[PDB]
């Protein structure tokens, strides 16, 4: 609390005024209380009690020419008083020639009296000015600088070099006479000097080219201003009137010498450390140093972790070097601190630091490997992590079809049909205690062309633009719908196997004929699905059930793992058909069924899809990818088709066989990472099954029925150019499409080993023999032949360095 | 049955055709040619040009110029030239009587779409017209409504960010940087071999190299080591002089530099950094659905394994629990044109149109 | 004896300078600056990173970044060599020798201000420091204690309502719109006139356009018509290398960000509005003061016509029997800077230095109990 | 102290010598002679032209026959110099925009062929600026084979900026016989054009203004001069002293579609960032024999001031020693006490092969 404000009557009345006089409140003398000088800022503080109730009004008064500071210090310590007095007191600004009435009415006496002047200004000037001088540069080997008394042509000589410092400009003027190592030390003394400063530039001017035409008109105006090209012919002096460049440097690197002021057992000791020539480790941090340059400077060097007695008394033994050898006033004492260290003060050392022995905002992401970890598949997954839906499906829809570039509207009656070579947008319309709310649906077909998947979407924009852009769209892929999707035909949705048109026309046929399968399969009790597949053996499955229409009669075929809500679906397909339905189960199979197939072929039929999940472990599948800088995997839960991409390698878990799905665009090193992988996974299976499990891998288009059969419907159109396993294996052939088995286990491998090679395979480019290490074929050569070709032996060429081992096979083709 | 015109006014390709129609019938290089020495030969006055591939037949006589060469039409006496080719040299039709539909770079200036209404109508007085954005047409060609284009043409790269329908034009993000600075990238560090290309007829045969031979590495610091430890990614091209030159890692540096454009002197941000950025400047809610949809558009983005390496990088500066998708259609160097026949062939258009009559007031 | 060290650092320019001083004695812009290229002359003095006036001085061969962007520190790295570069360089002095004032804006999160501390008291070992709240002493170099401040620097733009030397925090508003977003929205629509400004050397070229010909226009509607009507309103700009490129409507369409912050994208309300609901966050009885005080402050607030136009709007949105005062101090790029020269020179604030040995017995967490 | 050697490598001529020395001490032709049905190098190679067929290994700057140059080096150590190149660290000077496996070449024949305990390896253009105490400025080389525009900013380079014309010295040579031939004499003898590059040393020059110079030639006999041949005859060379050196500027008097040495100076300037073309524009710094003839300073001051703004400083620095200042850049460089930890030495190099020179030397 200031001092000022202690004798403060607190609760009691008052009147009292201060001034602010150098950032401290005076107070007033109570005789002179009324008279304010303009140059001057005051606070009042007026305590008077009004029938019980104490008013506090605090005011700070401002003359017309109050400086910054008294202004300011008037603010802050009115607001000090106030806390000071608990806050209670009101704060009014009052200034000259507009003062509140309550302000006046303290001075009712008509005592209020403008006084002229005021107490001066507590603030600092700060001015910006500056030095200007005219500074010279001679020597031999390293030039000294020197600056001169005045700025006048008989200051200088034509064999030298001169610096001409008028703060941001800065003259470099070279003597006729100038040698060569001056002229490059003095572009370093006025690059060092711009660059200290941040700002300026530097002019080089010759010995005679002192003219508009060579300077520049503005350049030589500032250039004549001090130094005028008239009185040059007669002050110039000459190379030789300037002195011998050998004295001038012999003389002043004598003249330099080292101090230090060291505070030891309490004493301060100031000891002439060195001389000439001086490096930066002689300066340590403990302790300050005098670096005596004589008339030409004295600096101080104080370190970061010296001594207050020795950052005091280094800077006054070094003030008094001053006037003992009674120097110039032109000499000067510079504090330098330890970091700031300027070019100048470099200069009087001749070792500091080291040369520069060898950034782009551009930043490539740099993520170093790691070997995934199977175990954490086994530790099971989140598969109802998210989960919302707005409503039950019970609102209105309308649903439209991609028909000839523009939207047909589906009739009631064809709800829950959808044809899986079109796209359809669907608008749904629910509302929640009368506010409504819509959800447009574009639902494309996996074999929709892009005129009708573009269609579905830009009207789909058209149909939310007429909604004011209140709905929500939502793009739905076949096969991949989403569970309020499901929930809007009542979780029961029929797929037909076609479509219309396309990019023009063609032969659009419309139905599924009379004689078509279809498969119906769901993963929950909402998502019971009817897709139309191919007639054909291949395609029925044992956990699912399927419905044959035919011209003679319709047939449900119940496989033996199928659940009743797969079953209820079917019978309800086959209870429109006019004939009547006949149910078979999966073994009772007669065979006018498998005639209308044509004929019984192998289908998918495992252990795992015949038995109920009671007992089983359901299937797993996980992609695994290198596409996000480290090979990761990552469970599929819901997994279908559309879920395999070419671009990465998936591993398929049924229990009595891991599947390993190789992609066709897929890297190598994610093929071989996805292998080892699966090694490593059943190798940390607890659960007791067998540890040499079948390990097979699958490659794109050459699927077998049972590993097709782990997922829903299966689209051979995609990547098996439309035929069945079994039309596969008769095209190509059971050793051309076999699942080759995973097997453990080259490199590493001593160069007696490696596999051989003669020098004339490994030499070529193409058309190589498999199992060739690319990168190291010259291992691929004997021992005898290996010295023939690189002249020397396997074991002396591999304790040559690297650098030679790489030319040694560039220069013999082997690279 | 009026048939509508769809011509895309690329940087250095225009693709021009019929609206629904698969792919556009006609696209040849956005090049007029003006002669050097004016009068010396027939078909060589002043008033003469020739445009397209014609234009670099005859390049020896002629200059030779890009109008719209950073996305921008900035020449319009050469533009008339380009579409007058369109209509009556490439498309063989009357501008009277077909609408046309055409395209406009990303912020396209109004001036810039006041200039090229008032060339069609009173130039070529077409009936309609109607200009649209490259980003949203190749959008609508990828079947989605919302997403993140990246367009990578050959004089400009663009990131524009699109949810349901409608672009921000806030985000978009613009790099002067595409398949034509790779071009020329690719003859420098190929003349640093010592195969010396710096002709025209040159650069024809270097852009054949980049089409067929460059890759986007994934790890670049990777591919380079291997590059240097041995030539297992050199690979041998045929010169038309039957001369055979080999490249190694030139393959991958020239597509690096959509990632570093420092190789080149440009101070700018790869095109991972400016797709970061662009949905950084969207609004947060809409961020989970762009970093789903990142559709590649544009020759430039057809560089094998440039969608794996956008994943890399993206995934490295979003959230670690964001899902990045990439999308990579396999007529993505069209997808700006197929999205405009879609457009053109809605029934709905007959109202987007600008007709002449409105024109004349 | 000892001297204090007042420093200002801002998100494009840092002011520096000794307390009792009437001006900062050092102001030079927050950048660090590294190089593009390869050095190819040995021995020539080349740096690895250039700060300051250097690093503008030599920006064609340079990347410029700002350690502060949008008032938050994101490279605290390069904000050390911004205060290696104050202290060692500009001021010349040795930190371990001179208390520092620093200055935070308002609602600053603690973990900037508790790393802030580490630095100076572990880095550079500052005998003691203090933090303040920037708006508060521009509100004192005004010589005020109540009134409501617009800070607009280079990174944020905030409105500080302060009643009796106390900021009302219910009350302060903050717009993410300041001086780079405006200089980026100049070199945006000066594309459309032909010229091209795109590295970060040629963003302080359209800097000083800014800060040199661009003005808030009174009515912005009747301006755009009167700059197609003539060329009265065209000025000529001369470039480094002598180009001379010219600017019509753009010199106030630039500023009219700050009222019509939808040119640049963003959804929010403009200075104008800002102001109008900072003061309409407070209590009734305080809106009259706050109304004749509004205090202006930060380079951003300097185009000429933004106080006339600001007590335009604000009459249009507060009541019309309410007086109006737009308060523009001439030296208001300096009014926080001033402020602090005032606190650190009063007798009574030796007892609010946070100390270092308080520093090394407490930790970083000491400067928020003693700045609240 | 180890005596350092300093051996420009230039593109007609070898500048080769001592560090320390103001000079190079030996100075002799880049050709090397082989027997066309052997090795003769510098000017012995020249006494036996019927004889042997003349090639250039550094035609154009950049070094191109190998064997070729090894005995250039052969000759310059051995012959010239007379030293061993196994006790003297030397500084090499190469091209701009030289090829890295160039660099890393030279770096293989100096260690493995001549076994130097150090060498290093430093841009002509840079040891020109350096010979002039600046770190900024744009250098023009015109040197014998190839002309050079070089930019450097405080000691960085501007390599997309540098330009390359393939007019230099011998294009003005044969071009001074073609138009020597046109009046009336005959310069077609190989012993015929090294009076012809005499005549072109001594008695062409720039003229401020081509079209103006020529209406005086064609007008008054006051710009002609006289020359004495070896065989006592004196002939007299007219508007051909000027003719010569336009060339320079205007490309299209030897068939060049090129442009002249101040579009392309203009040019290179433009190419570097904006901030930095002020600087550039004021220190516009000369080397190379082709920049030695009189009136070529004031004429390109002419000529770049009317390309670039009005209110731009321009400077034309014109070094009285500028046909060596490579060299006696070098010779600066490789003397300084700061620079013996620059120098690759052959252990280091043992080590890390030819490629160390693009990490110590740059
Ligand atoms: N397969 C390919 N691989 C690499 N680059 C390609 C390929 N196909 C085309 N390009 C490049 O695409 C560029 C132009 O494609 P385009 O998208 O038509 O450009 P714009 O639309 O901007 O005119 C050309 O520079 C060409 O080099
Ligand atoms: N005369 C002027 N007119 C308009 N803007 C200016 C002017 N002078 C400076 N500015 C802008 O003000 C900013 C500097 O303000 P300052 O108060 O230093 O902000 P900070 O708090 O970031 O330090 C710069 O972005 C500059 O562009
Ligand atoms: N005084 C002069 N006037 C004109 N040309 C000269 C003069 N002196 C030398 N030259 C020319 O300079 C060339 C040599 O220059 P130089 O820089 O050594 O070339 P390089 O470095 O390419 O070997 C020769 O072609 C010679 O004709
Ligand atoms: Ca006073
Ligand atoms: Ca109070
Ligand atoms: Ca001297
Ligand atoms: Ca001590
Ligand atoms: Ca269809
Ligand atoms: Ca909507
Ligand atoms: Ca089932
Ligand atoms: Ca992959
Ligand atoms: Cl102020
Ligand atoms: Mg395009
Ligand atoms: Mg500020
Ligand atoms: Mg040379």
């Keep these: ?815 | 049955e009026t048939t509508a015109l769809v011509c895309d006014n690329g940087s250095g390709l225009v693709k021009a055709g019929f609206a629904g129609d698969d792919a556009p019938r006609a696209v040849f290089p956005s090049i007029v040619g003006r002669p050097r020495h004016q009068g010396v030969m027939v078909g060589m006055g002043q008033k003469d040009s020739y445009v397209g591939d014609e234009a670099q037949s005859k390049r020896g006589i002629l200059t030779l110029k890009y109008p719209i060469e950073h996305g921008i039409i900035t020449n319009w006496d050469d533009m008339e030239k380009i579409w007058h080719h369109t209509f009556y040299n490439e498309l063989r039709v009357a501008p009277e009587e077909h609408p046309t539909l055409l395209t406009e770079a990303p912020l396209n200036p109004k001036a810039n779409r006041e200039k090229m209404t008032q060339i069609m109508f009173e130039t070529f007085n077409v009936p309609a017209m109607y200009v649209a954005i490259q980003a949203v047409l190749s959008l609508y060609a990828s079947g989605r409504t919302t997403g993140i284009v990246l367009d990578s043409g050959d004089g400009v790269t663009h990131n524009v960010p699109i949810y349901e329908g409608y672009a921000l034009p806030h985000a978009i993000m613009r790099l002067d940087l595409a398949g034509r600075d790779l071009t020329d990238y690719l003859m420098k560090i190929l003349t640093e071999r010592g195969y010396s290309f710096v002709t025209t007829a040159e650069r024809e045969i270097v852009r054949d190299i980049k089409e067929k031979l460059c890759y986007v590495a994934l790890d670049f610091e990777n591919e380079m080591a291997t590059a240097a430890s041995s030539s297992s990614l050199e690979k041998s091209y045929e010169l038309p002089d039957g001369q055979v030159i080999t490249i190694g890692n030139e393959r991958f540096r020239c597509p690096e530099t959509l990632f570093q454009p420092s190789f080149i002197g440009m101070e700018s941000a790869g095109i991972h950094e400016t797709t970061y950025n662009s949905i950084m400047k969207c609004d947060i809610d809409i961020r989970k659905d762009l970093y789903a949809n990142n559709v590649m558009s544009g020759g430039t983005t057809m560089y094998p394994g440039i969608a794996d390496r956008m994943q890399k990088e993206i995934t490295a500066l979003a959230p670690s629990t964001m899902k990045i998708k990439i999308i990579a259609p396999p007529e993505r160097k069209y997808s700006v044109w197929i999205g405009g026949s879609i457009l053109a062939s809605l029934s709905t258009f007959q109202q987007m149109w600008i007709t002449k009559q409105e024109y004349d007031e």
């Design chain 1, 1 to 815: 609390t200031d001092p000022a404000f202690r004798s403060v009557p607190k609760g009691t009345p008052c009147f009292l005024i201060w001034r602010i006089e150098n950032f401290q409140p005076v107070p007033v003398p109570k005789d002179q209380y009324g008279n304010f000088f303009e140059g001057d800022a005051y606070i009042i503080l007026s305590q008077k009690d009004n029938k019980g109730i104490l008013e506090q009004n605090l005011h700070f008064w401002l003359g017309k020419n109050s400086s910054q500071d008294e202004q300011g210090t008037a603010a802050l310590k009115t607001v000090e008083l106030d806390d000071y007095l608990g806050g209670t007191p009101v704060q009014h600004r009052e200034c000259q020639n507009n003062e509140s009435k309550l302000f006046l009415s303290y001075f009712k006496n008509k005592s209020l009296k403008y006084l002229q002047g005021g107490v001066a200004s507590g603030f600092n000037h700060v001015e910006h000015i500056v030095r200007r001088r005219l500074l010279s540069v001679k020597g031999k080997h390293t030039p000294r600088m020197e600056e001169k008394p005045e700025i006048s042509w008989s200051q200088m000589n034509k064999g030298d070099v001169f610096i001409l410092d008028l703060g941001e400009i800065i003259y470099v003027w070279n003597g006729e006479l100038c040698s060569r190592t001056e002229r490059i030390k003095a572009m370093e003394i006025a690059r060092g000097m711009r660059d200290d400063r941040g700002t300026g530039n530097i002019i080089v001017v010759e010995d005679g080219e002192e003219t508009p035409d060579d300077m520049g008109e503005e350049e030589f105006e500032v250039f004549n201003e001090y130094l005028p090209v008239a009185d040059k012919e007669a002050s110039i002096k000459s190379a030789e009137e300037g002195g011998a460049d050998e004295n001038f440097e012999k003389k002043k690197v004598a003249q330099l010498k080292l101090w230090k002021v060291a505070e030891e057992d309490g004493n301060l000791k100031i000891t002439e450390e060195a001389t000439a020539p001086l490096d930066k480790k002689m300066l340590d941090s403990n302790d300050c140093f005098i670096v005596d340059n004589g008339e030409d400077g004295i600096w101080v060097w104080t370190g970061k972790k010296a001594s207050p007695k020795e950052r005091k008394e280094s800077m006054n033994n070094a003030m008094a070097f001053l006037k003992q050898r009674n120097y110039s006033s032109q000499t000067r004492v510079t504090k330098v601190p330890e970091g700031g260290e300027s070019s100048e003060f470099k200069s009087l050392f001749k070792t500091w630091e080291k040369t520069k022995l060898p950034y782009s905002v551009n930043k490539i992401a740099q993520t170093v490997q790691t070997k995934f970890d199977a175990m954490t598949l086994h530790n099971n997954p989140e598969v109802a992590k998210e989960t919302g839906m707005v409503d039950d499906g019970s609102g209105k829809k309308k649903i439209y079809r991609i028909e000839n570039m523009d939207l047909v509207e589906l009739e009631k009656r064809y709800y829950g049909e959808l044809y899986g070579g079109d796209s359809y947008v669907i608008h749904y319309t629910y509302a929640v205690n009368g506010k409504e709310e819509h959800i447009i649906y574009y639902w494309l077909g996996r074999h929709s062309t892009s005129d009708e998947r573009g269609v579905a979407a830009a009207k789909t924009i058209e149909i939310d633009d007429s909604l004011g852009g209140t709905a929500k769209q939502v793009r739905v892929v076949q096969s991949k719908e989403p569970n309020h999707f499901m929930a809007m035909f009542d979780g029961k949705l029929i797929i037909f196997q076609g479509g219309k048109a396309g990019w023009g026309g063609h032969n659009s046929t419309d139905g599924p004929g009379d004689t078509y399968l279809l498969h119906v399969r769901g993963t929950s009790q909402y998502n019971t699905k009817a897709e139309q597949v191919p007639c054909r053996a291949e395609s029925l499955n044992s956990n699912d059930v399927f419905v044959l229409f035919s011209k003679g009669g319709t047939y449900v075929w119940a496989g033996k793992g199928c659940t009743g809500d797969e079953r209820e679906m079917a019978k309800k397909i086959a209870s429109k058909s006019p004939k009547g339905y006949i149910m078979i189960v999966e073994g009772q199979e007669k065979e006018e069924f498998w005639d209308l197939l044509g004929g019984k072929t192998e289908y998918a039929s495992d252990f795992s899809l015949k038995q109920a999940e009671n007992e089983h472990r359901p299937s797993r599948l996980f992609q695994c990818s290198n596409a996000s800088g480290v090979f990761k995997a990552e469970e599929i839960v819901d997994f279908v088709q559309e879920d395999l991409v070419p671009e990465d390698v998936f591993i398929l878990d049924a229990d009595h066989t891991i599947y390993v799905w190789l992609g066709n665009e897929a890297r190598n090193d994610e093929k071989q990472m996805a292998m080892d992988t699966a090694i490593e996974y059943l190798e940390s299976d607890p659960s007791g099954r067998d540890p040499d499990t079948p390990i097979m891998t699958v490659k794109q288009g050459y699927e077998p029925p049972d590993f097709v059969g782990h997922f829903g419907v299966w689209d051979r159109q995609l990547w098996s150019h439309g035929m069945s396993y079994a039309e596969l294996k008769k095209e190509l052939g059971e050793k051309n499409m076999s699942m080759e088995q995973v097997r453990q286990r080259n490199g590493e491998m001593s160069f007696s080993d490696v596999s051989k090679y003669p020098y004339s395979v490994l030499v070529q480019k193409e058309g190589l023999p498999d199992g060739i290490d690319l990168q190291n074929k010259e291992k691929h050569l004997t021992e005898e032949e290996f010295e023939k070709i690189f002249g020397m032996t396997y074991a002396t060429f591999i304790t040559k360095p690297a650098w030679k081992q790489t030319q040694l096979k560039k220069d013999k083709g082997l690279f």
